[PDB]
Design a protein around this ligand. Structure first.
Ligand SMILES: CCCCCCCCCCCCCC(=O)OC[C@H](COP(=O)(O)OCC(O)COP(=O)(O)OC[C@@H](COC(=O)CCCCCCCCCCCCC)OC(=O)CCCCCCCCCCCCC)OC(=O)CCCCCCCCCCCCC
Ligand SMILES: CCCCCCCCCCCCCC(=O)OC[C@H](COP(=O)(O)OCC(O)COP(=O)(O)OC[C@@H](COC(=O)CCCCCCCCCCCCC)OC(=O)CCCCCCCCCCCCC)OC(=O)CCCCCCCCCCCCC
Ligand code: BCL
Ligand SMILES: CC[C@H]1c2cc3[nH]c4c(c3C)C(=O)[C@H](C(=O)OC)c4c3nc(cc4[nH]c(cc(n2)[C@@H]1C)c(C(C)=O)c4C)[C@@H](C)[C@@H]3CCC(=O)OC/C=C(\C)CCC[C@H](C)CCC[C@H](C)CCCC(C)C
Ligand SMILES: CC[C@H]1c2cc3[nH]c4c(c3C)C(=O)[C@H](C(=O)OC)c4c3nc(cc4[nH]c(cc(n2)[C@@H]1C)c(C(C)=O)c4C)[C@@H](C)[C@@H]3CCC(=O)OC/C=C(\C)CCC[C@H](C)CCC[C@H](C)CCCC(C)C
Ligand SMILES: CC(C)=CCC/C(C)=C/CC/C(C)=C/CC/C(C)=C/CC/C(C)=C/CC/C(C)=C/CC/C(C)=C/CC/C(C)=C/CC1=C(C)C(=O)c2ccccc2C1=O
Ligand SMILES: CC(C)=CCC/C(C)=C\CC/C(C)=C/CC/C(C)=C\CC/C(C)=C\CC/C(C)=C\CC/C(C)=C/CC/C(C)=C/CC1=C(C)C(=O)c2ccccc2C1=O
Ligand SMILES: COC(C)(C)C/C=C/C(C)=C/C=C/C(C=O)=C/C=C/C(C)=C/C=C/C=C(C)/C=C/C=C(\C)CC/C=C(C)/C=C/C=C(\C)C(=O)O
Ligand SMILES: COC(C)(C)C/C=C/C(C)=C/C=C/C(C=O)=C/C=C/C(C)=C/C=C/C=C(C)/C=C/C=C(\C)CC/C=C(C)/C=C/C=C(\C)C(=O)O
Ligand SMILES: COC(C)(C)C/C=C/C(C)=C/C=C/C(C)=C/C=C/C(C)=C/C=C\C=C(C)\C=C\C=C(C)\C=C\C=C(C)\C=C\CC(C)(C)OC
Ligand SMILES: CCCCCCCCCCCCO[C@@H]1O[C@H](CO)[C@@H](O[C@H]2O[C@H](CO)[C@@H](O)[C@H](O)[C@H]2O)[C@H](O)[C@H]1O
Ligand SMILES: [Fe+3]
Lengths: 39, 335, 60, 271, 69, 38, 179, 124, 52, 56, 57, 69, 56
C-alpha cells in the first residue's frame, strides 16, 4: 500500500504527515460540493 | 546439511531428580521432589525441581498477593464489576494515584487511598524478596552479587516513590496499569521537557543497549565454542581450556582487545547494574534540580540548531501566551 | 553558581566513577594470557598486570 | 604483541576472499580482504562525516548533525549539500557493516569456532538497514531515514514516535521492549551467578556447576542450563533487534493512523 | 492438638504472623483513608462532630496543580 | 514432634491466642466508646 | 619446539604454515590446551563424565531416538562406524559423547556430542548420525583414552580439538578461499 | 492548557502535575484525530512548548480554540430553551461544537473548498 | 471419612483456608466499594436513610 | 455408569469439576452484579415492578 | 462403526469433546449477551414484539 | 511420469495444496475487500447497479486532498 | 515458655524483630511527618490549640 507523505518540517527532523493512498482517494472522491447558484 | 548450531537438544538424558545441596532447614524447607518437562528440556534443563520456602519468601508472597489483590479489585470495580468488561478492557484499567491537591497527606479511599496501600505492600514484598535472595545466596556459600544487582533494580523502582515525595505530591506516582503506566511515562517526559535531554536517561539507554550487545556477543561466543566444552565456564575459568583461548583470540583479532572467561561476566554485571543505577539518578534529578531538560540541554550545548519554522509578531507574542492549567469546572453553567 | 548545577556535578561524578570502573575491569581482563609475547620483551598495557590470584579447592 | 598462547593459533587459511596476500596480523588485529574493505569504508565515511560537520554551523560534538535529504527527491541521490552527503555516508556505513560481519566470519572460520557471532551481529545490521533502506524504500523517499547526529537522531526518534500519536501502543514495540528488559534482567542474573560461584563467600572453595542449578531451583523453582542460559541470552538479545525492526517497519508502510486506534480489533471481538 | 502433628508449628507460626500483620496494616490504612476515622487529623473531634455518610466517589477535585508543599 | 510436645505447645498457643484475641476486644470497646461505627 | 609450523615470510604479523599433519601436531584450530591430567569431578567426588553402562540410573527420555546401533555418516558421506555407548555428564544430565565402534572394529573412538547433527535437524526420521567435520578415514586417528570408565580434562580437550580442526583441515577445499 | 516550565530550575511559577499533562495529552490527541493529522503538524515534539520551532498551523489552531469558545458560549449554548427535549443532552443542555464539527477529520474543512466567496449574505 | 484416603487432608485444608480467605476479602471489598454498604462511613445511618 | 471412574481418575475429575464450577459461579454472580436489573447490593430492596428493564 | 475407538483414544477424545463443547457454549452465550436483541439479563422480561430489531434497509 | 521420481509426490502434494489454498484465500479476500465484488453486502445488485471504478477524471479548483508541504 | 527458644533460633528472631521494629518506627514517624497536625519539624512550636484539626 502506497503512503502519501507530506513534509511539514526541516529535513531530518521527522516532522511528516502520512496518509494511506486508497482511503484518502475514496474519502476525497465521496465529497460532493453543491454547485454555486447563478448570481 | 548444516553444522550443529547448538540451538536445540535432540537427545535428552534422564535420571533421578536432584534433591539439592544440603542446606540449613531450621526456618524453611524445600517443597516438591523434582519433575521433568520434555518441552523445557529441548531448550535448556528439564527439571522443574523443588523450591525452597522460608520466612522471607512466605512473608513476601503474602504482602505481594495483598498488593495484587488490591490492584485487581480496584480495576474490577472501575468497570462496575463486569467480568466481560474486566477482561475486554484489562489493558486500559488502572489503580490511579491520589489527586494533586492533597500533596503528601492521606487521600480518600476511593481517590488514591487504595493506591498507597497497594504501593506500600508491593514495596514491602519486594524488600522481603531481596532478603530471600540474599539468604538463598548465602546458604550455598556463594557471593552476594545477585543481591546487589537486585538492589540496583530496587533503587530504580524506589525513585518512583522518592521523586514524587521530593516534588511534594503522591499524584506524581506511577499508576498500576498496563496502558496507563505507559501513559504516565509519556506524560512524565512531556511535563519535564523532553527526557531525551536528561544526561542520565541517555546514559541508562547506553547501558541498556550495551547489555543487549554484550549478551548477544557472549551468547554467540559461548555457543560458537560449545563444541569444545565452552559452556562449562567454571572449569574454563579455573582451568583454562582451548574454548576459552579461542574465545579470547576471536575478540582480540576482531576489535584489538579482549576479556577473559571470568571478567566478561564482570562486564555483563556492571552494564546491567548501571542501566538502573544511572536511570534512578536521572529520575531523582527531575523536577527537583531540573524542570526542563531541553532547556538544560540548550544551556549545556546539547541541542542542534534548526531553521525557524515560524516567526511571531509583537501582538502575536502577547496573544499567543496562554495560561497554566488549573482545576476542572465543578459546575455546569447555563448560558 | 549559575552555570554549574546539580545535574552537571552528578554527571561528572558518574564519569569519574565510570572511568575508575573501566580501569578495574581492564585490570581483571589481564589475569590470563599475560604478559604479552613481543620481540622487545614482556609487555603490559595500561593498567599494568595485577597480582597473581589463586582459588580455593575442597580437600579430598 | 601476542598473548602467551596466541602463537600456535596464528595459521593460514579460513578466509573467504583472498589468499596469502591478506592473511596477516596488524598488531593485535587480523587483516583480511574484508579488513581492508572495512578500513576503506570506515575512512571514507568518517572523513565525509567530518566534512559534514565542517559544512555545519558548529564543531560541538553533541550538536553536529548530517541530515538526510528532503522527501521531494524520493529515492534519488540528492545534491551533496542538500542531503546527498547523508546518502553517501549511508552507503559507506552499509559497506563497512557488511565487511565487519564477513571479516568476523573469516576469523571464526580460522579458529575452528561456529558461525554464531556474525549472525548475531546481523540482527543489528538488519535493524539499521530497516531504518535507512527498507522503510525509506517502502515509503518512497530516502528522506525518511534518521540524521547522523548524537542528539539530532534523538529528535528524529521523538518526532517519528509522535507521528503516531502514542507510539507506546505499537504492539511490536511492546514486544521489543519486553525483549530488551528481559535481556537486561537475564544478563544481570547470569553475570551474578557466574561471579558468585567463582568468587564465593570468603574462606569457602570455588563452587561447582551443580551449585548454580541448585541455587536457581531453590529460588525460582526452575533452573535453565549452562548452555540454556547462553541460548536464552542470544535469543533475547537478537529478538529485541528483530522485533525493533518489525515495529519500525510497520509504522508508515502498513499503519498510518494513531497506534491506540489499532486496538479496535480487540474491542470488536464478537464475544 | 493433633493439628500440630499435620502442620509443623514452625511454618504455621510464620504464616499466621504474616497474615495478622497484613490484616492489621490493611485495616489501619483503610481507617486512615476514611473521612470518619482519619484519627491522625480529626481524632480530637467528638463523636457528634465526626463526619457521617461521606462516601462521595468524587469527594475531592481530581484535576489541579500541585500545592506549594 | 511427639504427642506430648504437641500438647505442651497447644496449651501455650491457646492461652496466647485467647489473651491476644480479646485484648483486641478491649481495644474494640475503647474505639466504640470514642467513635461508634453503627 | 612443539609448534610444527614455519612462518610464511619474515614480515611480522604473517601467518604460519604447518609442516606435518596439523591434526595430530596440534596447530591452528587443531590445537589443545594443556589441562590437568585428572578427571573432572562432581560435588560428591565422582567422575563427572561416565558411560551409561557404568551408571544404570541414567536412561534416555521417552520421545528421543536412541543413538546406539545407528550408523555414523562422516564428512565424505561414508559410514565410519556405529554407536555402541553413550557417555553422559553426571553433574548436568546431558549427552556429552558417543562411543563409536569402527567398521573393522577392534577399537573404539570418542565423538563429542557437539559435533553431531541429526537428519532434518532431528525433526524427521533419525536413522543416521551426521558428522560434517571429519571424514571416515580420520576417525581412526582420534586420540585414544587411557581408561574406558573415565576421561580426563586433557583427553577431553584433545578429542574436542582434533574434531574441531577438521572444519579447516579435513579436505583441501576447506582451508582454501571460496573465490 | 500549558504545563511546561519556561525555566531550567523548578519554582512556584509552574506547579503542573503529570496528571494535568495527561489531560493536555488527551485533548491534543482528540485535536489530532479531528484534523486527521499527527502531533508534528503543529509541533516540534523535541519541545512542545516552542512556537518558533513549530509550523505556522499551531498559531491557526490556537485561534480555532478562541473562535470555538465564542461560538459555544454566545450562540449554541443560549439556544437551550428553543430546542425540543430530543435535541438536548442528558442534563438538558444545548448541543455544542468541536473541531471535528467543521473539519470532519481533514486538515481543512472539505479539503479547503471555497464556497462562501459566492454567497455575500454570509460574509462578515 | 474415606474421602480423606483419596485426598490429602493437609492440601485440602490449605486450599480451603486460602480460598475462603480470598472470598471473604473479595466480599468485604465489594461491600466497602458500594454506596449502600460503605459501613466505615455509612454505618451509623439507619436502614431507611441508607442509600438505595 | 460407574465404569467412567475406571477410565478417568476420580481425583483429577473432581478437582477439575470443582474448579470449573467455582469459576462459572463467580462469572454468573458478577455478570448479574454488574447489570442494572440485578445489582442486588444497591437495588436489592426494590420490588420486581421497580427494577430496571432493558429498552424496548 | 465402533472400530473408530481403535484409532483414537476414547479417554483423549472425550476430554477434547468436553473442552470444545464448553468453549462453544460459552462463546455462543457471550455473543448473545453482548447483542442488543438477546441481552436477556436486562431485557429478558420483554415480549417478542418489544424486543429490539436491527436496522433495516 | 518420470517427474515423480525427481520430486517426492508427498512433498509436491503438500506444497500444491498449501499454495492453491493460500491463493484461493487471497483472491477471495481481495475480492471481498473491493467495492465492485463485496458480494456479502452488495451481491444482490444487478451487473448494471454494481459499482464501477471511475473513468478518466477531471481536475479540481482550490481543493487538495493533501495538506501543503 | 522459654522452650520457644528451642523451636526458633534466638539469633534469627532478634534480627527479624529488630528489622520489623525499625521499619514500623520509620513508617510511623514518616506518616506523622507527612500529616498536617503532626508535621513537627515545621509546626512543632504551635500550642495544642493552634495545631491543625481535620474538618468537622
Ligand atoms: C538501594 C540503594 C542502593 C542501590 C544500588 C546498589 C548498587 C550496589 C553496588 C555494589 C558494588 C559491589 C558489587 C559486588 O561485586 O558485590 C559483591 C560483594 C560481595 O562479595 P562477597 O559475597 O563478599 O564475596 C567475596 C568475594 O568473592 C568478592 O570478590 P568479588 O570479585 O565479587 O569482588 C572483588 C572485590 C575485591 O575487593 C578488593 O580488592 C578490595 C578493594 C575494593 C575497592 C575499595 C575502594 C572502592 C572505592 C571507595 C570509594 C568510592 C566512592 C564512590 O571488589 C569489589 O567487590 C569491587 C571492586 C571495585 C569495583 C569498581 C570500583 C571503581 C571505583 C572508582 C573510584 C573513582 C576513581 C577515580 O558485595 C560487597 O559489598 C563487596 C564489598 C564488601 C566489603 C565492604 C565494602 C564497603 C566498606 C565501607 C562501608 C561499610 C558499610 C557502611
Ligand atoms: C579509539 C581508541 C584509540 C587508541 C589509540 C592508542 C592505542 C592504540 C592501540 C592499538 C593496538 C595495540 C598497538 C599495536 O600493536 O599497534 C599495531 C602496530 C604494530 O604492528 P605490528 O605489531 O608491527 O604488526 C604489523 C604487521 O602486520 C606488519 O605490517 P606492515 O608494516 O607490513 O604493514 C601493515 C600495514 C601498514 O603498511 C605500511 O606500509 C605501513 C607504513 C605506511 C602506512 C600508511 C600507508 C598508506 C599511504 C600513506 C597514508 C598516510 C599519508 C599521510 O599494511 C596494511 O595493509 C595494513 C593497513 C590496512 C590497508 C588497507 C586499507 C587501505 C586504505 C587505508 C586508508 C586509511 C589509512 C591511510 O603498533 C604501532 O604502530 C605502534 C604505535 C601505535 C599506532 C597507532 C597510533 C594511532 C594514533 C592516533 C592519534 C589520534 C587519536 C584520536
Ligand atoms: C515518551 C517516553 C520517553 C521516555 C520516558 C522514560 C521514563 C519516564 C523513564 C524512562 C526510563 C528508561 N528508558 Mg525511556 N523514554 C523515552 C525513550 C526511550 C527509548 C527510545 C528508543 O526512544 C529507550 C531505549 C528508552 C530506554 C529507557 C531505559 C534505559 C530506562 C529504564 C530501564 C528499566 O526500566 O529497566 C527496567 C527496570 C525497572 C523498571 C526497575 C524496577 C523493577 C522492579 C524491582 C520489579 C518489581 C516487579 C514486581 C514484584 C512484579 C509484580 C507486580 C504485581 C502487581 C504484584 N527510553 C521517551 C523520551 N524512560 C527510566 C529511567 O531510568 O529514566 C532515567 C524511567 O523511569
Ligand atoms: C539490572 C536491572 C534489571 C533487573 C535485575 C534483577 N531483577 C531481579 C533480580 C535482578 C538481578 C533478582 O534477583 C530478582 C529475581 O528473583 O529474579 C529472578 C528480580 C526480580 N525482577 C522481577 C521483575 C522485573 N524486573 C524488571 C527489571 C530488571 N530487573 C532490570 C532490567 C522488570 C521490569 C522491566 O519492569 C520486572 C517486572 C521479579 C521477577 C523479581 C523480583 C520478585 C519480587 O520482588 O517478588 C515479590 C513477590 C510478589 C510481588 C508476589 C506476587 C504474586 C503474583 C504476581 C500475584 C498473584 C498471582 C496468583 C497466585 C495467580 C494468578 C492470578 C489468578 C486470578 C489467575
Ligand atoms: C543483537 C543485536 C544487538 C547488538 C549485537 C551485536 N553488536 C555487535 C555484535 C553483536 C553480536 C558484534 O560482534 C559487533 C562487534 O564487533 O562488537 C564488538 C557489534 C558492534 N555493535 C556496535 C555498536 C552498537 N550496537 C548496537 C546494537 C545492538 N548490537 C543490538 C541491540 C548499537 C545501538 C543500539 O545503537 C550500537 C551503537 C559496535 C561497537 C560493533 C560493530 C563495529 C563495526 O561495525 O565497526 C565498523 C565501523 C566502524 C569502526 C566505524 C563507523 C564507520 C561508519 C562508516 C561511520 C559512519 C557512521 C554513521 C554516520 C552513523 C552515525 C550514527 C549517529 C546516530 C551517531
Ligand atoms: C528468486 C526469489 C524468490 C528472489 C526474491 C528476492 C528479492 C525479491 C529480493 C529483492 C531484490 C532487489 C531488487 C534488491 C537489490 C539487492 C542488491 C542490489 C543486491 C546486491 C548483491 C550483493 C551480493 C551485494 C553486494 C555485492 C558485493 C559483496 C560486492 C563485492 C564485490 C567485490 C568482491 C569487489 C571488491 C571491490 C569492492 C567491494 C569495493 C569497495 C572498495 C573500493 C570501492 C575501493 O576503491 C578499494 C580500493 C582499495 C582497497 C579497498 C577498496 C574497497 O574496499
Ligand atoms: C537454516 C536456519 C536458518 C536455521 C537456524 C535456526 C534459526 C532459523 C534461527 C533461530 C530461530 C529460532 C529457531 C527461534 C525460535 C526459538 C523459540 C522456539 C523460542 C524460545 C522461547 C523461550 C525459550 C522462552 C521465552 C523467554 C521469556 C519470554 C522469558 C524469559 C524469563 C526468564 C528470565 C528466564 C530465565 C530462566 C532462569 C531461571 C534462568 C536463571 C539461570 C541463569 C541466569 C544462569 O546464569 C544459569 C547458569 C547456569 C546454571 C543455571 C542458570 C540459570 O538457570
Ligand atoms: C458479591 O458476591 C459475589 C462474590 C459476587 C458472590 C459470590 C459467590 C460465590 C461463588 C460464593 C461461593 C461460596 C462458596 C463456594 O462453594 C462457599 C463454600 C464454603 C465452604 C465449603 C466452607 C467450608 C468451611 C470449612 C471449615 C472452616 C472447616 C474447618 C475445619 C476444622 C476447624 C477442623 C480442623 C481439623 C482438625 C482439628 C484436625 C486435627 C487433626 C487430627 C484429627 C489428626 O491429625 O488425626
Ligand atoms: C476492612 O475490612 C476488611 C479488612 C476488608 C475485612 C476483612 C476481613 C477478614 C477477612 C478478617 C479475617 C479475620 C481472621 C481470619 O481470617 C482473623 C483470625 C484471627 C486469629 C485466628 C488470630 C489468632 C492469633 C493468635 C496468636 C496471636 C497466638 C499467639 C500465641 C502465643 C504467643 C504462644 C506462642 C508461644 C509458645 C507456644 C511457646 C511454647 C512452646 C513450647 C512449649 C514448645 O515449643 O515446646
Ligand atoms: C480475579 O480477579 C482478582 C481481583 C481476584 C485478581 C486479579 C488481579 C489482576 C487481574 C491484577 C492486575 C494487575 C495489573 C494488570 C497490574 C499492572 C501493573 C503495572 C503495569 C505496574 C507498573 C508500574 C507501577 C509502579 C512503578 C508503581 C510503583 C509504586 C510505588 C513505588 C509505590 C510506593 C508506595 C509506598 C512506599 C507507600 C507507602 C505508604 C505511606 C508511607 C505513604 O503511607 C502513608
Ligand atoms: C508474543 C508473540 C511471539 C513473540 C516471540 C516470537 C518468537 C519468534 C520471533 C523472534 C525470532 C525471529 O526469527 C528470526 O528469523 C529470521 C528469518 O525470518 C532470521 O533472519 C533475519 O535476520 C537475519 C540476520 O542477518 C537476516 O540475514 C535475515 O534476512 C532476516 O530474515 C533472524 O535472525 C531471526 O531472529
Ligand atoms: Fe557465560
Amino acid at each position: 500500500t502506497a503512503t502519501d507523505s507530506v513534509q511539514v518540517g526541516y529535513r531530518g527532523t521527522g516532522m511528516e504527515q502520512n496518509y494511506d493512498h486508497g482511503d484518502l482517494k475514496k474519502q476525497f472522491a465521496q465529497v460532493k460540493i453543491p454547485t454555486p447558484l447563478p448570481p | 546439511m548444516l553444522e550443529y548450531q547448538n540451538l536445540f537438544t535432540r537427545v535428552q538424558v534422564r535420571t533421578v531428580p536432584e534433591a539439592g545441596i544440603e542446606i540449613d532447614e531450621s526456618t524453611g524447607t524445600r517443597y516438591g521432589t523434582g519433575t521433568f518437562s520434555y518441552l523445557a528440556g529441548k531448550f535448556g534443563d528439564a527439571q522443574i525441581g523443588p523450591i525452597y520456602l522460608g520466612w522471607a519468601g512466605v512473608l513476601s508472597l503474602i504482602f505481594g498477593f495483598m498488593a495484587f489483590e488490591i490492584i485487581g479489585l480496584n480495576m474490577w470495580a472501575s468497570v462496575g464489576w463486569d467480568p466481560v468488561e474486566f477482561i475486554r478492557q484489562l489493558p486500559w484499567l488502572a489503580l490511579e494515584p491520589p489527586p494533586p491537591q492533597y500533596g503528601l497527606r492521606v487521600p480518600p479511599l476511593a481517590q488514591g487511598g487504595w493506591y498507597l496501600m497497594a504501593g506500600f505492600f508491593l514495596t514491602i514484598s519486594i524488600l522481603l524478596w531481596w532478603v530471600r535472595v540474599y539468604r538463598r545466596a548465602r546458604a550455598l556459600n556463594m557471593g552476594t552479587h545477585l543481591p546487589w544487582a537486585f538492589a540496583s533494580a530496587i533503587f530504580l523502582y524506589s525513585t518512583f516513590f522518592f521523586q514524587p515525595l521530593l516534588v511534594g505530591s503522591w499524584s506524581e506516582m506511577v499508576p498500576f496499569g498496563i496502558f496507563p503506566h505507559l501513559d504516565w511515562t509519556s506524560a512524565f517526559s512531556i511535563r519535564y521537557g523532553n527526557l531525551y535531554y536528561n544526561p542520565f536517561h541517555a546514559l541508562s539507554i547506553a547501558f541498556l543497549y550495551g547489555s543487549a550487545v554484550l549478551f548477544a556477543m557472549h551468547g554467540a561466543t559461548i555457543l560458537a565454542v560449545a563444541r569444545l566444552g565452552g559452556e562449562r565456564e567454571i572449569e574454563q575459568i579455573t582451568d583454562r581450556g582451548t574454548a576459552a583461548e579461542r574465545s579470547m583470540l576471536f575478540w582480540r583479532w576482531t576489535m584489538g582487545f579482549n576479556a577473559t572467561m571470568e571478567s566478561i561476566h564482570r562486564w555483563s554485571w556492571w552494564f546491567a547494574v548501571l542501566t538502573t543505577f544511572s536511570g534512578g539518578i536521572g529520575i531523582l534529578l527531575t523536577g527537583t534540580v531540573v524542570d526542563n531538560w531541553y532547556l538544560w540541554g540548550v544551556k549545556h550545548g546539547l541541542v542542534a540548531p534548526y531553521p525557524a519554522q515560524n516567526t511571531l509578531t509583537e501582538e502575536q507574542q502577547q496573544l499567543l501566551r496562554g495560561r497554566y492549567q488549573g482545576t476542572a469546572p465543578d459546575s455546569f453553567p447555563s448560558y | 553558581m549559575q552555570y554549574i548545577d546539580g545535574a552537571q556535578i552528578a554527571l561528572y561524578a558518574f564519569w569519574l566513577f565510570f572511568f575508575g570502573l573501566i580501569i578495574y575491569i581492564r585490570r581483571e581482563d589481564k589475569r590470563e594470557g599475560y604478559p604479552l609475547e613481543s620481540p622487545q620483551g614482556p609487555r603490559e598495557g595500561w593498567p599494568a598486570m595485577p597480582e597473581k590470584k589463586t582459588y580455593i579447592h575442597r580437600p579430598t | 604483541a601476542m598473548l602467551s598462547f596466541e602463537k600456535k593459533y596464528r595459521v593460514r587459511g579460513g578466509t573467504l576472499i583472498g589468499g596469502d596476500l591478506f592473511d596477516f596480523w596488524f598488531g593485535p588485529f587480523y587483516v583480511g580482504f574484508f579488513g581492508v574493505t572495512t578500513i576503506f569504508f570506515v575512512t571514507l565515511g568518517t572523513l565525509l562525516c567530518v566534512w559534514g560537520a565542517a559544512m555545519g554551523p558548529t564543531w560541538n560534538l553533541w550538536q553536529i548533525s548530517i541530515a538526510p535529504p528532503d522527501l521531494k527527491y524520493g529515492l534519488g541521490l540528492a545534491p551533496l549539500r542538500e542531503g546527498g552527503l547523508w546518502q553517501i555516508i549511508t552507503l559507506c556505513a552499509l559497506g563497512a557493516f557488511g565487511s565487519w560481519a564477513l571479516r568476523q566470519a573469516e576469523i571464526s572460520r580460522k579458529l575452528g569456532m561456529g558461525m554464531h557471532i556474525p549472525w548475531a551481529y546481523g540482527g543489528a545490521v538488519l535493524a539499521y538497514a530497516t531504518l535507512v533502506v527498507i522503510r525509506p524504500m517502502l515509503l518512497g523517499a530516502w528522506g525518511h531515514g534518521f540524521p547522523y547526529g548524537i542528539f539530532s537522531h534523538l529528535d528524529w526518534v521523538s518526532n517519528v514516535g509522535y507521528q503516531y500519536l502514542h507510539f507506546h501502543y505499537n504492539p511490536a514495540h511492546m514486544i521489543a521492549v519486553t525483549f530488551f528488559f528481559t535481556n537486561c534482567l537475564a544478563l544481570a542474573m547470569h553475570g551474578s551467578l557466574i561471579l558468585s560461584v567463582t568468587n564465593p563467600k570468603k574462606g569457602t572453595p570455588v563452587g561447582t556447576s551443580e551449585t548454580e542449578n541448585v541455587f536457581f531451583r531453590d529460588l525460582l523453582g526452575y533452573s535453565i542450563g549452562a548452555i540454556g542460559i547462553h541460548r536464552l541470552g542470544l535469543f533475547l538479545a537478537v529478538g529485541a533487534a528483530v522485533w525493533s525492526a518489525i515495529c519500525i517497519v510497520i509504522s508508515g508502510p502498513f499503519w498510518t493512523k494513531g497506534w491506540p486506534e489499532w486496538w479496535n480489533w480487540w474491542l470488536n471481538l464478537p464475544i | 492438638h493433633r493439628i500440630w502433628l499435620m502442620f509443623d508449628p514452625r511454618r504455621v507460626m510464620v504464616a499466621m504472623v504474616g497474615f495478622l500483620a497484613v490484616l492489621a496494616l490493611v485495616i489501619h490504612f483503610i481507617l486512615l483513608s476514611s473521612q470518619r476515622y482519619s484519627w491522625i487529623e480529626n481524632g480530637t473531634l467528638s463523636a457528634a462532630q465526626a463526619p457521617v455518610g461521606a462516601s462521595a466517589p468524587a469527594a475531592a477535585a481530581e484535576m489541579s496543580p500541585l500545592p506549594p508543599g | 514432634m511427639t504427642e506430648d510436645e504437641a500438647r505442651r505447645f497447644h496449651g501455650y498457643f491457646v492461652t496466647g491466642t485467647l489473651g491476644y484475641i480479646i485484648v483486641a476486644a478491649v481495644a474494640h470497646f475503647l474505639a466504640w466508646q470514642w467513635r461508634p461505627w453503627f | 619446539s612443539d609448534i610444527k609450523a614455519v612462518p610464511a615470510d619474515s614480515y611480522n604479523g604473517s601467518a604460519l604454515i604447518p609442516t606435518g599433519d596439523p591434526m595430530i601436531d596440534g596447530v591452528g584450530p587443531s590445537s589443545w590446551a594443556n589441562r590437568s591430567d585428572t578427571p573432572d569431578m562432581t560435588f560428591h567426588n565422582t567422575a563427572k563424565i561416565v558411560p551409561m553402562r557404568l551408571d544404570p540410573t541414567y536412561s534416555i527420555a521417552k520421545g528421543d531416538p536412541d543413538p546406539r546401533g545407528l550408523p555414523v555418516v562422516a564428512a565424505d558421506k561414508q559410514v565410519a562406524g556405529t554407536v555402541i555407548e553413550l557417555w553422559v555428564n553426571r553433574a548436568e544430565p546431558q549427552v556429552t559423547y558417543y562411543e563409536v565402534q569402527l567398521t573393522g572394529s577392534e577399537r573404539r573412538v570418542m565423538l563429542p556430542a557437539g559435533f553431531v547433527q541429526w537428519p532434518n535437524f532431528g525433526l524427521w526420521g533419525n536413522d543416521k548420525l551426521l558428522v560434517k567435520a571429519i571424514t571416515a578415514a580420520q576417525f581412526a586417528n582420534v586420540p585414544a583414552l587411557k581408561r574406558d570408565d573415565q576421561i580426563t580434562l586433557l583427553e577431553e580437550d584433545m578429542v574436542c580439538a582434533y574434531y574441531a580442526g577438521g572444519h579447516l583441515y579435513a579436505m583441501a577445499e576447506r582451508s582454501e578461499p571460496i573465490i | 492548557a500549558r504545563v511546561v516550565t519556561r525555566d531550567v530550575a523548578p519554582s512556584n511559577a509552574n506547579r503542573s502535575s503529570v496528571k494535568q499533562t495527561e489531560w493536555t495529552y488527551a485533548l491534543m490527541i482528540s485535536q489530532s484525530r479531528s484534523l486527521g493529522v499527527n502531533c508534528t503538524y503543529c509541533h516540534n515534539t523535541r519541545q512542545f512548548a516552542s512556537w518558533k520551532e513549530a509550523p505556522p498551523a499551531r498559531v491557526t489552531a490556537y485561534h480555532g480554540i478562541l473562535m470555538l469558545r465564542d461560538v459555544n458560549q454566545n450562540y449554541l449554548s443560549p439556544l437551550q430553551p428553543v430546542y425540543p427535549s430530543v435535541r438536548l443532552g442528558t442534563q438538558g443542555d444545548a448541543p455544542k461544537a468541536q473541531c471535528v464539527t467543521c473539519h470532519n477529520g481533514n486538515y481543512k474543512p472539505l479539503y479547503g473548498a471555497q464556497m462562501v466567496k459566492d454567497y455575500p449574505a454570509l460574509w462578515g
